Amino acid sequence: LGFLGAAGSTMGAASMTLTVQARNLLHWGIKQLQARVLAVEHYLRDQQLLGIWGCSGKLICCTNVPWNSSWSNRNLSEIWDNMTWLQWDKEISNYTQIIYGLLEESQNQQEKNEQDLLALD
Amino acid sequence: LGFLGAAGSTMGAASMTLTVQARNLLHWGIKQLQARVLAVEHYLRDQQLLGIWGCSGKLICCTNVPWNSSWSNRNLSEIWDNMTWLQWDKEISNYTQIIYGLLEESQNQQEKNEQDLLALD
Amino acid sequence: LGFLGAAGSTMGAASMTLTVQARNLLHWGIKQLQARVLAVEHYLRDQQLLGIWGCSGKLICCTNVPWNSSWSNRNLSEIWDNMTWLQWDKEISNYTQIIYGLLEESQNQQEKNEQDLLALD
Amino acid sequence: ENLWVTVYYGVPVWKDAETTLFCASDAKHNVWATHACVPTDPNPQEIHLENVTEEFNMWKNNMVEQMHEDIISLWDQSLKPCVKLTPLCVTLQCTNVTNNITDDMRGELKNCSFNMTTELRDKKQKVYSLFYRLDVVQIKEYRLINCNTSAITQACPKVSFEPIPIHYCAPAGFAILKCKDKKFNGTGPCPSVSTVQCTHGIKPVVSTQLLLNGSLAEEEVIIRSENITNNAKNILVQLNTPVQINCTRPNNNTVKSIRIGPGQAFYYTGDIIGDIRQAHCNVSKATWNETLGKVVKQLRKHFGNNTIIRFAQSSGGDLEVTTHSFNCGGEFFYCNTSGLFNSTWISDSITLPCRIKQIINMWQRIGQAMYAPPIQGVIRCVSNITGLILTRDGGSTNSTTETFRPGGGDMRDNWRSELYKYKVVKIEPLGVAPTRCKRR
Amino acid sequence: EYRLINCNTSAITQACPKVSFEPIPIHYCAPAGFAILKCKDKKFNGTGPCPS
Ligand SMILES: *[C@@H]1O[C@H](CO)[C@@H](O[C@@H]2O[C@H](CO)[C@@H](O)[C@H](O)[C@H]2NC(C)=O)[C@H](O)[C@H]1NC(C)=O
Ligand SMILES: *[C@@H]1O[C@H](CO)[C@@H](O[C@@H]2O[C@H](CO)[C@@H](O)[C@H](O)[C@H]2NC(C)=O)[C@H](O)[C@H]1NC(C)=O
Ligand SMILES: *[C@@H]1O[C@H](CO)[C@@H](O[C@@H]2O[C@H](CO)[C@@H](O)[C@H](O)[C@H]2NC(C)=O)[C@H](O)[C@H]1NC(C)=O
Ligand SMILES: *[C@@H]1O[C@H](CO)[C@@H](O[C@@H]2O[C@H](CO)[C@@H](O)[C@H](O)[C@H]2NC(C)=O)[C@H](O)[C@H]1NC(C)=O
Ligand SMILES: *[C@@H]1O[C@H](CO)[C@@H](O[C@@H]2O[C@H](CO)[C@@H](O)[C@H](O)[C@H]2NC(C)=O)[C@H](O)[C@H]1NC(C)=O
Ligand SMILES: *[C@@H]1O[C@H](CO)[C@@H](O[C@@H]2O[C@H](CO)[C@@H](O)[C@H](O)[C@H]2NC(C)=O)[C@H](O)[C@H]1NC(C)=O
Ligand SMILES: *[C@@H]1O[C@H](CO)[C@@H](O[C@@H]2O[C@H](CO)[C@@H](O)[C@H](O)[C@H]2NC(C)=O)[C@H](O)[C@H]1NC(C)=O
Ligand SMILES: *[C@@H]1O[C@H](CO)[C@@H](O)[C@H](O)[C@H]1NC(C)=O
Ligand SMILES: *[C@@H]1O[C@H](CO)[C@@H](O)[C@H](O)[C@H]1NC(C)=O
Ligand SMILES: *[C@@H]1O[C@H](CO)[C@@H](O)[C@H](O)[C@H]1NC(C)=O
Ligand SMILES: *[C@@H]1O[C@H](CO)[C@@H](O)[C@H](O)[C@H]1NC(C)=O
Ligand SMILES: *[C@@H]1O[C@H](CO)[C@@H](O)[C@H](O)[C@H]1NC(C)=O
Ligand SMILES: *[C@@H]1O[C@H](CO)[C@@H](O)[C@H](O)[C@H]1NC(C)=O
Ligand SMILES: *[C@@H]1O[C@H](CO)[C@@H](O)[C@H](O)[C@H]1NC(C)=O
Ligand SMILES: *[C@@H]1O[C@H](CO)[C@@H](O)[C@H](O)[C@H]1NC(C)=O
Ligand SMILES: *[C@@H]1O[C@H](CO)[C@@H](O)[C@H](O)[C@H]1NC(C)=O
Ligand SMILES: *[C@@H]1O[C@H](CO)[C@@H](O)[C@H](O)[C@H]1NC(C)=O
Ligand SMILES: *[C@@H]1O[C@H](CO)[C@@H](O)[C@H](O)[C@H]1NC(C)=O
Ligand SMILES: *[C@@H]1O[C@H](CO)[C@@H](O)[C@H](O)[C@H]1NC(C)=O
Ligand SMILES: *[C@@H]1O[C@H](CO)[C@@H](O)[C@H](O)[C@H]1NC(C)=O
Ligand SMILES: *[C@@H]1O[C@H](CO)[C@@H](O)[C@H](O)[C@H]1NC(C)=O
Ligand SMILES: *[C@@H]1O[C@H](CO)[C@@H](O)[C@H](O)[C@H]1NC(C)=O
Ligand SMILES: *[C@@H]1O[C@H](CO)[C@@H](O)[C@H](O)[C@H]1NC(C)=O
Ligand SMILES: *[C@@H]1O[C@H](CO)[C@@H](O)[C@H](O)[C@H]1NC(C)=O
Ligand SMILES: *[C@@H]1O[C@H](CO)[C@@H](O)[C@H](O)[C@H]1NC(C)=O
Ligand SMILES: *[C@@H]1O[C@H](CO)[C@@H](O)[C@H](O)[C@H]1NC(C)=O
Ligand SMILES: *[C@@H]1O[C@H](CO)[C@@H](O)[C@H](O)[C@H]1NC(C)=O
Ligand SMILES: *[C@@H]1O[C@H](CO)[C@@H](O)[C@H](O)[C@H]1NC(C)=O
Ligand SMILES: *[C@@H]1O[C@H](CO)[C@@H](O)[C@H](O)[C@H]1NC(C)=O
Ligand SMILES: *[C@@H]1O[C@H](CO)[C@@H](O)[C@H](O)[C@H]1NC(C)=O
């Protein structure tokens, strides 16, 4: 189970290696600087997105957005055992923009307001 | 609803857009790199202030530091419903370093010890 | 107790200053840019490591991984009151990689699984 | 009551700031930015900010300085691969040209010859070419202008000088504010403010005494200066209507070239085909007459009632500031603007003579010089005036009259006419507030 | 009479006598966030799916 050794594995099996994958995410002088700056800017963008979702403290988290069955006509056991993450990512690639927008609107925007009201009272 | 569209809104109304604003915060080759490196450093420094305060998990948080209302003689409705954030920033421009110092020292130092004492037993 | 003034004190006393230390952790154009970029990558890697451990929100945290008695033949109160951090770091320098691996492997891998089951219910 | 400190992130507050801006362009070789920059956003966004009165001050705008340094460095890069003319500083014996010529001031065009080197170190050749009087100084024996002051570099003939628009875009964490208010004088609070990711494209058009190919005022002629009461200051006038400029060179000049050394070649003016005639530029009389009347009316508002306003040609200084510089086809022209400013105001066309110079120094730098290659054939160039640069001869309190003369000599003042609209600010997302709340 | 070839076209620079032209093996490595995949197949014509 080296880096990306999980790539051919079922989506469920792959969950065992998430930590390992995370560890590997982080004029000649100009070439070095452009590559390094981009690696950092990219890294931070992913972390900011999790921070909006409130999931930044975890590799795995749950959300309050319900699944739209039209995104994929499959059973839970079907997805977790009969597919790889590579196949899955392609299958729902049309809806990733929608899901990200829903996570912010349905959870982040709603929860911060309700918690503020409780704090205010 | 777009970036800085909240500038004319009241401080209370403006709070709806905080997430939107957050998303947009993140020879010639040298000049371009200096701008990008500094943009990253500035971003990280603000995150460090929140991390010390313990507020880094949220866009909005409460603290244990009392307002000390003599800093400005205004009512909450006079501030939140009748004024912009742009105007507010000027009203407390001479107290900002004081408030930040209070948060780092008067709150975090007490909280870390009480949490450790509970952990010890 | 200025920057690194704590270094002369015993390990227990040094804990008072952790915030002070935290504040200071963050042709010719190439030298300037490379120095800044490397400082940032190092900073971010330490935060990533804490995130794996689940301690990213705190200066001080506890884990459920047991201490190996072979790592150091000393009393707990002896270490805190009779040593400096500079001395302590040398005595366990052979075991640092082992401890870091245990925190990642032996505890956080289990908690993510239990949380998934609780969230599922 | 029991108010507490709270913290907010993402707060919509900005502060004045200066930062490097990223150049971009909508745009085979050209001296301009297209080689040094990236493609623009095809659909720029703009957000109006309601109830915002943000202050602008064009005279302190750092964007002007940033553009200047980028333009100078950009221009210099185009000459780095190009041919050096150091071997050409010679005795250069010359004689008067005799032909079917209507001429100019006598001696304006000369027939010169010199001993020049060849591809081989062992051999020399005798050559001849035409030169303009402006490029030749008497020692009969002559020297090329600046042979005793600087090296001369030949511009590469393949490279176009035609202006290409330049856009500037903010880096993350920064934003560019734009003043939309009509009839803004460049200073004070702007009643209507909006935010843009990038600026409108600005063409690097170089001219003196008149502003060419720029933006027009939306409704009426706008007069602005750093200090309206200080006669030393340049006054920029933006027109609300265009006035065209039609320039031509009728002579049908030809171009010949000779290889010099193993790595270089030199281009020079050959025999002129047909009659030799004076280069010139037209200015419409009727259009200009109306244009001046509008400017005078606005000047009276700034300088008071019943003041007689006159215009005149510059009293002195170098050719760069006493004449109107053009770049058409890569040829550099200097024209006498007298007759445009020859008027007094109380209550079909003009033809201006022009001269051509092949040795120029666009940025007025000591120790630098460039030789333009000659352009073959007849040149026609059509462009327009979008503003004027004026100075006062006044400051006197002893008269009921006032006189204006053309200003110029500082390229930064031309860019101000397009950049006065913009300001750069930094976004500061962190802030605090009193609202009552509790926490564990 | 003769001319060195291309005196009519370009300047000529003498190679420095102390500089060898002997090849040195070069390895290329990925930046962080990237990885290089290697095809292990045999009789591969450089295109299409690689089975390993
Ligand atoms: C070309 O011809 C003109 C006209 O004859 C020459 O200009 C004259 O120069 C002389 C001698 O100094 C003066 O006395 C005249 O007043 C000039 N005539 C003008 C200005 O109309 C000119 O010098 C000749 N050029 C050469 C190189 O011989
Ligand atoms: C380069 O040569 C020109 C021409 O000789 C010099 O300009 C002259 O300067 C003297 C000083 O006595 C004057 O009397 C002349 O009127 C000038 N001639 C012209 C045609 O303007 C120039 O000074 C020399 N070098 C520099 C740096 O100026
Ligand atoms: C643009 O117009 C404004 C007024 O709309 C000018 O503001 C002046 O500021 C001075 C400051 O001492 C005041 O004394 C003046 O009373 C203000 N206006 C007037 C009409 O007096 C501003 O200076 C103008 N900018 C320029 C460059 O002229
Ligand atoms: C201006 O000069 C050019 C040549 O430099 C003339 O172009 C020539 O036109 C004749 C027409 O019969 C052709 O045969 C030649 O081959 C052309 N020469 C070229 C293309 O180099 C042009 O006609 C002249 N313009 C005039 C006389 O008005
Ligand atoms: C600018 O205006 C002048 C004056 O009308 C034009 O001069 C005439 O040009 C034509 C050829 O285009 C000649 O046949 C006339 O004899 C000229 N009139 C004169 C010399 O009095 C001139 O051509 C105009 N320039 C342009 C580019 O249109
Ligand atoms: C533009 O041309 C005018 C002439 O049309 C030049 O001015 C003349 O200067 C002489 C000497 O001072 C005066 O006697 C004339 O009265 C002026 N104009 C006349 C008489 O019409 C003017 O200097 C030229 N401008 C440039 C920059 O060369
Ligand atoms: C001002 O803009 C006009 C329009 O682009 C320029 O006229 C063009 O010039 C180019 C380059 O010579 C020609 O290819 C175009 O055909 C011209 N357009 C016409 C004649 O309609 C004019 O040259 C510009 N002025 C300056 C000083 O650059
Ligand atoms: C490949 O498939 C086999 C079953 O055919 C499975 O046992 C093995 O774990 C899979 N390999 C990976 C990397 O998923
Ligand atoms: C699922 O997606 C479709 C298409 O956007 C939408 O019409 C439907 O309302 C969605 N269902 C949600 C909660 O069910
Ligand atoms: C998914 O559930 C349906 C229920 O009818 C079943 O018919 C189908 O075979 C299931 N798919 C898989 C892959 O088990
Ligand atoms: C996903 O998007 C691609 C690109 O538009 C499209 O070809 C594919 O059919 C889509 N998949 C769907 C709609 O299931
Ligand atoms: C308000 O705060 C200031 C310090 O900023 C303090 O000096 C003053 O006494 C305070 N007023 C109180 C606590 O009533
Ligand atoms: C603030 O307004 C409330 C009513 O909303 C009023 O009861 C209170 O006295 C005000 N506080 C002041 C004026 O300090
Ligand atoms: C809002 O503030 C303005 C001054 O900016 C004041 O004139 C007005 O009375 C305030 N409105 C209230 C308190 O309702
Ligand atoms: C804050 O300082 C400024 C000068 O920098 C002063 O004009 C203003 O009155 C001060 N505010 C308070 C509340 O003292
Ligand atoms: C503690 O250290 C000993 C070696 O001194 C090792 O054999 C034992 O497995 C360790 N216990 C752990 C790592 O839990
Ligand atoms: C640890 O404490 C014991 C008594 O519990 C004592 O005998 C021993 O010397 C101590 N070890 C030290 C100080 O290293
Ligand atoms: C730490 O313990 C040693 C034991 O020899 C003692 O000599 C030393 O003085 C102690 N340091 C203290 C008490 O600060
Ligand atoms: C740590 O390793 C070094 C290697 O030289 C060794 O000398 C030292 O005794 C080791 N420390 C312990 C406590 O084993
Ligand atoms: C000023 O703010 C108010 C907030 O309700 C907004 O309705 C208004 O449109 C803004 N400006 C103008 C000119 O209306
Ligand atoms: C001048 O015109 C005449 C008559 O057309 C022509 O013969 C002559 O060649 C032209 N110029 C010269 C220098 O001969
Ligand atoms: C070129 O050199 C020769 C020999 O000195 C001389 O006769 C001739 O006049 C020179 N040509 C020029 C244009 O000076
Ligand atoms: C313009 O210059 C005059 C000279 O007396 C000065 O008095 C005035 O303050 C200046 N106006 C400005 C700087 O706006
Ligand atoms: C150029 O000629 C046009 C007519 O073709 C005329 O309308 C315009 O005024 C001229 N521009 C000048 C003289 O600057
Ligand atoms: C320059 O003088 C030479 C003398 O031989 C003549 O051949 C040539 O045609 C002249 N050039 C011009 C443009 O008159
Ligand atoms: C400009 O036109 C007006 C009539 O509209 C005329 O009176 C005036 O004399 C003309 N030009 C000048 C310089 O007066
Ligand atoms: C002169 O003053 C009158 C009012 O008395 C005004 O109508 C006119 O426009 C003024 N003229 C100017 C400012 O040129
Ligand atoms: C310029 O104005 C003066 C004074 O009215 C006049 O004598 C002169 O002829 C004018 N020049 C031209 C070219 O009209
Ligand atoms: C002025 O010249 C510019 C050159 O680009 C042209 O785009 C503009 O339409 C002209 N203005 C006129 C003819 O009114
Ligand atoms: C240089 O000489 C070579 C000899 O083969 C010839 O082929 C070539 O055209 C020449 N180059 C030039 C630029 O005349």
Author numbering:
A (entry chain F), B (entry chain B), C (entry chain D): 520 to 545, 570 to 664
D (entry chain C): 32 to 58, 65 to 142, 151 to 184, 189 to 309, 312 to 322, 322A, 323 to 397, 412 to 504
E (entry chain G): 190 to 241
The authors write:
C05, which is the most potent neutralizer of BG505 pseudovirus, was chosen for structural characterization. A complex of a BG505.MD39 version with C05 Fab was formed and we obtained a density map at 3.8 Å overall resolution. In our structure, only two of the three exposed epitopes are occupied by C05 Fab, despite extended incubation time with a large excess of C05 Fab. Our structure confirms that indeed C05 Fab variable region recognizes a conformational epitope comprising C3/V5 Env regions. The solvent-excluded epitope/paratope area between C05 and Env amounts to 479Å2. C05 HCDR2 recognizes a pocket that comprises the D-loop (E275-N283), V5 (S460-R469), the N234 glycan, and R456. The latter (R456) partakes in CD4 engagement and engagement of R456 by C05 HCDR2 suggests that occlusion of CD4 binding may be part of its neutralization mechanism. HCDR1 further stabilizes C05 binding by interacting with the base of helix α2 and its associated N355 glycan bridging the paratope gap toward HCDR3. HCDR3 makes extensive contact with the N-terminal part of V4 thereby facilitating order in this region (N386-V401). Interestingly, W395-V401 folds back on itself to display I396 and V401 for stabilizing interaction with LCDR1.
HIV Envelope (Env) is the main vaccine target for induction of neutralizing antibodies. Stabilizing Env into native-like trimer (NLT) conformations is required for recombinant protein immunogens to induce autologous neutralizing antibodies(nAbs) against difficult to neutralize HIV strains (tier-2) in rabbits and non-human primates. In recent years, several modifications have been found to allow the folding and production of trimer proteins that resemble the native viral Env conformations, or native-like trimers (NLTs). Here, we show that DNA-encoded NLTs fold properly in vivo and induce autologous tier-2 nAbs in mice.
